[PDB]
Amino acid sequence: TIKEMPQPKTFGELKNLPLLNTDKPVQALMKIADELGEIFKFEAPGRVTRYLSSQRLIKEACDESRFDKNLSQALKFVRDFAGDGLFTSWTHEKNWKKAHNILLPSFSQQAMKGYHAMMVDIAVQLVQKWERLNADEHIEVPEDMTRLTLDTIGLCGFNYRFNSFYRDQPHPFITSMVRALDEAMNKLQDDPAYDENKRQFQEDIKVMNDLVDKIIADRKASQSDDLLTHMLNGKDPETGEPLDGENIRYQIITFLIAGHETTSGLLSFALYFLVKNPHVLQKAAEEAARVLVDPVPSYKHVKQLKYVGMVLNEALRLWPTAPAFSLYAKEDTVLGGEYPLEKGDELMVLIPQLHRDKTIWGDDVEEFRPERFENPSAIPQHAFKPFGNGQRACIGQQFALHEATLVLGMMLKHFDFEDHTNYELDIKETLTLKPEGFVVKAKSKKIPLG
Amino acid sequence: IKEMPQPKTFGELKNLPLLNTDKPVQALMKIADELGEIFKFEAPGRVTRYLSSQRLIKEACDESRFDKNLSQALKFVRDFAGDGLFTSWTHEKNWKKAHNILLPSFSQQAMKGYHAMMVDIAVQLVQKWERLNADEHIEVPEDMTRLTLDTIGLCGFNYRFNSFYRDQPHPFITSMVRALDEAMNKLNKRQFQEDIKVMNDLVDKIIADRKASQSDDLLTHMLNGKDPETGEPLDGENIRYQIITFLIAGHETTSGLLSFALYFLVKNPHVLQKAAEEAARVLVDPVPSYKHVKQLKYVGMVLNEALRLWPTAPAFSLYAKEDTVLGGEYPLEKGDELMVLIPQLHRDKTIWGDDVEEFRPERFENPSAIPQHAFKPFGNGQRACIGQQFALHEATLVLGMMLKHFDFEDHTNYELDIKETLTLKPEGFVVKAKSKKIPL
Ligand code: HEM
Ligand code: HEM
């Protein structure tokens, strides 16, 4: 029953590390997985981790009684500015449970329609921007999606307006965030040239915290019942204390980052797949048209864009924008009845590979067909993990899906899209996935919003 | 006969060391304060005579004796504006031609066609200000320029510059600004030939766009329109000069006007109260209707007084058609140049009284009581501003919505600093706006 774990061989003392010398490490890992199978050990100096690609093993990895969320080296680098926020704290860190309990009601389905109006504000800003384009012009999809998602999390979460649509370049916070996370992902592979880039990592951390100070200072000046309000007032009395200021600043950074990037990616990929599959686009457009009948979409009409939701879930299947998460083995145990694991050992869920499991999805894994999600309960458990797992799963999942569904819905409702460049897919990696350089032309239906 | 007053001369330099400045009109205003209603000004190779009194200017505005002159500035603008309406001689074929062809485009029939689009850009402005955080403030002439440029773009050529989707000025604006810093640099090679590149980015984009698709706007008349005297066309070359012309002339001065108007309103709180009251009482529709804009009488008066104190097109030039005598005192030979120094004119105490520096819109309660040729911010005669009603309509609509939707605050106690670039603007002018929170 015991077996030997597959591994790409070493580069002497660098071990396996020089293989992730690329703009696209996750995709490279995807081919390694295609070659070596459901599981392979990957060694870097001082670090060992095991990549899982099959549902059979991952369903085991998701047993919370045997495995807990691990802070990967990447997450440990992000913690330099995310601190002990929800995303970068250990499960058994006190402030994790404290902040989890305090912030969880802010992601109840109650709060979601407190958020709805504010979501509609930003969505309308996007629609208006596209309506106002001249014929020559085209849409830079992931850029505008980023504008929308960041403004949305800013407004709903902290009553703060980034005003991303009043800028033809990315917002300063965005530039600094992307630079601080591509930098962290650069540290994944201490020399002095790296002194100098550390100086730039401190500067972009500074810039993100200037903004945070603007959100706090703005909150001083006015009455809100949003995420920030719960962070200041909210109380967990298992602990009996409010989140102290430092942690609140970490949570603000955390939610600003996590609460926009992956969703921007998701919307981007979804539009891409829609224009690459014209019929799916027609069907989705039909649903959007039949359902979104109010000048601005109410909430409850957003909830039966079921086919839109399925489209988004399929987009998440093929290219999960948060493409991986790490776990550690609590105690000595055996995985899959074949691979023995010592306490502390790391596992990495290679999510796109998992989602390409032919054992689960059939042989047509590479094709885009949303109807896979017609009967969700047929899908084996732990087979679909775009939002992580268990008690450490994405708290903003409902937020992301509602926003994405609302926006994609209004998009399909208000515009016809055209792949005027016959765009060739090119995926950029920055701990998250995005279709870089993706552009389209949109010709308006001319339905007003009022 | 009498001898014409003149500032001291410095040998070959003549009067030139007296205009060593970034702000010539204001310096000339001081010179006028010193020498009175008329003075000759000599620079090497150039002589012009500056007029400041209504008495003399009403004579200067006699079209049978004086015609529009292209000052050196206008002559340099002519390098990219060519023989468009603003930079062509009256006796050039294309002036009368294009004037006849384009004149109906600024009748009131066309004017309420424009209203909806004006409201479009205006709403974009209001929305921008509604969406500012508490930290933030407004850069007034920058946003006014965004709005005026977008408005003339949409109304004129059905093209959206989308200036409010940029946190920086549109490329055309920057290029234009050094196209006129150019005019006075002449007092950079082909990076000015380059600002010509970009201004015709603009032009080629607008032509190709009109090509690509029911519009009947300025561009439409430029294309179809024809001259009932000659029956001859604006040739393509001239059409592009006219497009440039209307984009330039049709935005900067209006932006300036709105800027100065807001400035004077925040420096004079009671006037702000009355104007705001009119705006609130009249603008009752979610978006302002056409004829309600026409009932913003006090806002119109505010704008007129702002033009009185600082006319954004602050001067214009004339030449003597034939030998003649001016004011029965100063003989002029054919070709001699005159300059109407408009702000001084608007500060003539024989006309407006002794408190000329005060901002009082109520001066314009009865516009027809005001003597003629006393108020000339839009030039004179057949060479007067063709875009006058357009500018005033936009400005009234916009100022009205501004007063209706916001309370304004001079949070820096801004000290007026007027920048001159063929036009006037209050540079660095900033305010804070607190929303009344009235929806649109
Ligand atoms: C397409 C959209 C999104 C995707 C694909 C996504 C994906 C994920 C994944 C995979 C994790 C697990 C990370 C790990 O286990 O290491 C996670 C956690 C998390 N996500 Fe998201 N997410 C999305 C949207 C959002 C939004 C909109 C928010 C906030 C408004 C958010 C906030 C969070 C937080 C706070 C955690 C960690 C919570 C905890 O550990 O207590 N996410 N997400
Ligand atoms: C407050 C706003 C404005 C002011 C103060 C202003 C001022 C003037 C002045 C002083 C002249 C005469 C120039 C000279 O005699 O050398 C003029 C002419 C002209 N203006 Fe305006 N202007 C304004 C707005 C506009 C607008 C909005 C447009 C177009 C949409 C426009 C287009 C023109 C044109 C084409 C001429 C040349 C007239 C001709 O020779 O047929 N202006 N303007």
Q: Print the SS3 string covering chain A.
A: CCCCCCCCCCCHHHCCHHHHCCCCHHHHHHHHHHHHCCEEEEEECCEEEEEECCHHHHHHHCCCCCEEECCCHHHHHHHHHHCCCCCCCCCCCHHHHHHHHHHHHHHCCCCHHHHHHHHHHHHHHHHHHHHCCCCCCCEEHHHHHHHHHHHHHHHHHHCCCCCHHHCCCCCHHHHHHHHHHHHHHHHCCCCCHHHHHHHHHHHHHHHHHHHHHHHHHHHHHCCCCCHHHHHHHCCECCCCECCCHHHHHHHHHHHHHHCCHHHHHHHHHHHHHHHHCHHHHHHHHHHHHHHCCCCCCCHHHHCCCHHHHHHHHHHHHHCCCCCEEEEEECCCEEECCCEEECCCCEEEEEHHHHCCCHHHHCCCCCCCCHHHHCCCCCCCCCCCCCCCCHHHCCCCHHHHHHHHHHHHHHHHHHEEEECCCCCCCCEEECCCEEECCCEEEEEECCCCCC
Q: Does A223 touch chain B (CB under 8 A)?
A: no
- Secondary structure element (H or E) that encloses residue B414, with its range: none
- Chain B nearest-CA residue for A213: B135
Alpha-carbon distance of B217 to B149, in angstroms, equals 16
Strands A346-350 and A433-435: unpaired
Q: Which of residues 195-214 of B touch A (CB under 8 A)?
A: 205, 208-209, 212-213
Q: Is B66 a catalytic residue?
A: no
Q: Is B421 helix (H, G, I), strand (E, B) or coil?
A: coil
Strand partners, B227: none
Q: Give yes or no for a contact between B393 and B293, defined as CB atoms under 8 angstroms apart.
A: yes
Q: Is B41 helix (H, G, I), strand (E, B) or coil?
A: strand
Alpha-carbon distance of A425 to A438, in angstroms, equals 7
Alpha-carbon distance of A132 to B161, in angstroms, equals 9
- Type of residue at B348: D
What CATH number labels B1-440?
1.10.630.10
Cβ–Cβ gap A160/B128 under 8 Å: no
Strand partners, A365: none
Q: Does A193 touch chain B (CB under 8 A)?
A: no
- Among candidates A135, A167, A169 on the partner chain, residue whose Cβ is nearest the Cβ of B212: A135
- Type of residue at B103: L
Q: Closest Cα of chain B to A356: distance in Å?
A: 40
Q: Is B145 a catalytic residue?
A: no
Give the number of other Cβ atoms within 10 Å of residue A416's Cβ. 12
Q: Does B132 touch chain A (CB under 8 A)?
A: yes
Q: Find how far residue A429's CA is from the centre of its chain.
A: 12
Q: Is B89 helix (H, G, I), strand (E, B) or coil?
A: coil
The CA–CA distances, whole Å, from B82 to A160, B101, B106, B177, B210 equal 48, 17, 22, 17, 22
CATH superfamily of A1-450: Cytochrome P450 (1.10.630.10)
Cβ–Cβ gap B135/A222 under 8 Å: no
Q: What are phi and psi of A121, to 5 degrees?
A: -55, -55
Q: Which residue, B302, B326, B294, is CA-closest to B397?
A: B294
Q: What residues of A are in contact with residue B213 (Cβ under 8 Å)?
A: 135
Alpha-carbon distance of A249 to A212, in angstroms, equals 7
**Residue ranges of B for the binding site for heme?**
385
Residues of A carrying an active site annotation: 262, 387, 394
Whose tokens are 């915290």? That residue is: A209
Q: Find how far residue A388's CA is from the centre of its chain.
A: 10
DSSP assignment letter at B363: G
Alpha-carbon distance of A353 to B429, in angstroms, equals 58
Alpha-carbon distance of A447 to A256, in angstroms, equals 32
Q: Find how far residue A157's CA is from the centre of its chain.
A: 17
Q: What residues of B are in contact with residue A169 (Cβ under 8 Å)?
A: 167
Please tell me the distance between residue A394's alpha carbon and the centre of ligand 1 in angstroms: 4
Q: Find how far residue A402's CA is from the centre of its chain.
A: 14
Of all protein residues, the one whose alpha carbon is nearest to atom 40 of ligand 1 is: A392
Whose tokens are 């004011």? That residue is: B327
Please tell me the distance between residue A397's alpha carbon and the centre of ligand 1 in angstroms: 7
Give the number of other Cβ atoms within 10 Å of residue A234's Cβ. 20
Alpha-carbon distance of A84 to A100, in angstroms, equals 12
- Tally of CA atoms within 13 A in the half-sphere of A18 that contains its CB: 7
Of all protein residues, the one whose alpha carbon is nearest to atom 20 of ligand 2 is: B385
Alpha-carbon distance of A49 to B131, in angstroms, equals 47
> Which residues neighbour B238 within 8 Å (Cβ) at sequence distance 6 or greater?
B82, B83, B84, B94, B98
Q: Find how far residue A449's CA is from the centre of its chain.
A: 29
Resolution (A): 2.4
Q: Closest Cα of chain A to B132: distance in Å?
A: 7
Question: Order of strands, edge to edge, in the sheet holding B66-68?
Answer: B38-43, B46-51, B337-341, B315-320, B66-68
Q: Give yes or no for a contact between A252 and A215, defined as CB atoms under 8 angstroms apart.
A: yes
Q: Give yes or no for a contact between A236 and A97, defined as CB atoms under 8 angstroms apart.
A: yes
Q: Which residue, B164, B173, B163, B174, is CA-closest to B132?
A: B164
Q: Is B345 helix (H, G, I), strand (E, B) or coil?
A: helix
Q: Is B412 a catalytic residue?
A: no
Domain edges within chain B:
1-440
Longest dimension (CA), chain B: 65
Find the Cα–Cα–Cα–Cα dihedral A222, A224, A227, A232, rounded to 10°. Answer: 60
Strand partners, A334: A340
DSSP assignment letter at B2: -
- Among candidates B131, B134, B165 on the partner chain, residue whose Cβ is nearest the Cβ of A218: B134
- Quote the tokens at residue A286: 């039909």
Of all protein residues, the one whose alpha carbon is nearest to atom 18 of ligand 1 is: A394
Cβ–Cβ gap B165/A160 under 8 Å: no
- Torsion sign over Cα B385, B386, B389, B391: negative
DSSP assignment letter at B387: T
Q: Which residue, B254, B296, B262, B271, is CA-closest to B408?
A: B262
Cβ–Cβ gap A135/B213 under 8 Å: yes
Technique used by the depositors: X-ray
Whose tokens are 């917002």? That residue is: A171
Q: Is B319 helix (H, G, I), strand (E, B) or coil?
A: strand
Q: Which of residues 315-354 of B touch A (CB under 8 A)?
A: none
Q: Closest Cα of chain A to B131: distance in Å?
A: 7
C-beta pairs of A241-248 under 8 Å, 24+ apart in sequence: A241/A98, A242/A102, A243/A95, A243/A98, A243/A99, A243/A102, A246/A83, A247/A83, A247/A84, A247/A85, A247/A95, A247/A99
Strands A346-350 and A47-52: parallel
Q: Give yes or no for a contact between A327 and A346, defined as CB atoms under 8 angstroms apart.
A: yes
